[PDB]
Curated annotation (Swiss-Prot):
Residues reported to bind Ca(2+) 1: P175, V177, D200
Any one GO molecular-function label of the UniProt entry: serine-type endopeptidase activity
Higher taxonomy: Eukaryota, Fungi, Dikarya, Ascomycota, Pezizomycotina
Cofactor(s) annotated in UniProt: Ca(2+)
Species for this entry: Parengyodontium album
Any Gene Ontology biological process: proteolysis
Keyword entries, A-Z: Calcium, Disulfide bond, Hydrolase, Metal-binding, Protease, Serine protease, Signal, Zymogen
Positions contributing to Ca(2+) 2 binding: T16, D260
Keyword Calcium on entry: yes
Complete-protein stretch covered: 106 to 384 of 384
Functional summary from the UniProt entry: Hydrolyzes keratin at aromatic and hydrophobic residues.
Protein name: Proteinase K
GO cellular component: extracellular region
Disulfide-bond pairs as recorded: C34-C123, C178-C249
């Protein structure tokens, strides 16, 4: 129902005004849904996941998250203290090394793995892919995200932290997915956050408290941290029966807090992820 002194980002997507500390959410909490965190992997043994995280694939020497990125974003997606969808099932897809840098061919293979792996998983409510990465433009990277999107995964992707138009970044520039920009605690666009027309929605992405490796917690910033909020939100909304995978992105845009964000350039949408929860 409510999470007192939640991280500011969870409290944000649950209210129209900034500055709040409580996260209001339906009891569903993303149950019956699944989110594929495609990043540095997940420390599944973090007790904040309560066994609901599991590595399903890696592209490196081991499955462990030696970085922290993936378990952070997995935590924002669905840790029960730092998660939007606190009851969602999380799958780890390690396409990024422990240094946080993988090849496009690896990221692409990860996206097509998920597009088929979901078929041997139970997700009666729907399937999300939080894709907290990005690089320069690539039609094939863009193609893999679109393939993942058309396969029936609601794909959320970060706009990138270059403070530029996201049109030059992939899979940020793939139109069919959900290109998420980063906001800050005071309803400003994050200083690093990319923008542009391809952006669909903005997520809390500055100073985001979430799980870390080693059983720790950490506060980090980036559009990489904003897309878990949206992917969690989509996993939350999908469970509630509000939207499908192929329609959740434009659903979150229609029900977003509109016009609240400052420093939004003309042409970029002024929408902010919002669960519109009535208690």
């Amino acid at each position: 129902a409510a999470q007192t002194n939640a991280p500011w980002g969870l409290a944000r997507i649950s209210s129209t005004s900034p500055g709040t500390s409580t996260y209001y959410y339906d009891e569903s909490a993303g149950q019956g849904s699944c989110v594929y965190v495609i990043d540095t992997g997940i420390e599944a043994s973090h007790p904040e996941f309560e066994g609901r995280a599991q590595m399903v694939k890696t592209y490196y020497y081991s499955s462990r998250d030696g970085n922290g990125h993936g378990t952070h974003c997995a935590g924002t997606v669905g840790s029960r203290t730092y998660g939007v969808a606190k009851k969602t099932q999380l799958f780890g897809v390690k396409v990024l090394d422990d240094n946080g840098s993988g090849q496009y061919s690896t990221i692409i293979a990860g996206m097509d793995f998920v597009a088929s792996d979901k078929n041997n998983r139970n997700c009666p409510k729907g399937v999300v892919a939080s894709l907290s990465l990005g690089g320069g433009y690539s039609s094939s990277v863009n193609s893999a995200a679109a393939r993942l999107q058309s396969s029936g995964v609601m794909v959320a992707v970060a706009a990138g932290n270059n403070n530029a138009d996201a049109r030059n970044y992939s899979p940020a520039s793939e139109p069919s997915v959900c290109t998420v920009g980063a906001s800050d605690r005071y309803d400003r666009r994050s200083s690093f956050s990319n923008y542009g027309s391809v952006l669909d929605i903005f997520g809390p992405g500055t100073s985001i408290l979430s799980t870390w490796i080693g059983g720790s917690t950490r506060s980090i910033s980036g559009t990489s941290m904003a897309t878990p909020h949206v992917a969690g939100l989509a996993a939350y909304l999908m469970t509630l029966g509000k939207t499908t995978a192929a329609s959740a992105c434009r659903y979150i845009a229609d029900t977003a807090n509109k016009g609240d964000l400052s420093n939004i350039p003309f042409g970029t949408v002024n929408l902010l992820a919002y669960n519109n929860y009535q208690a």
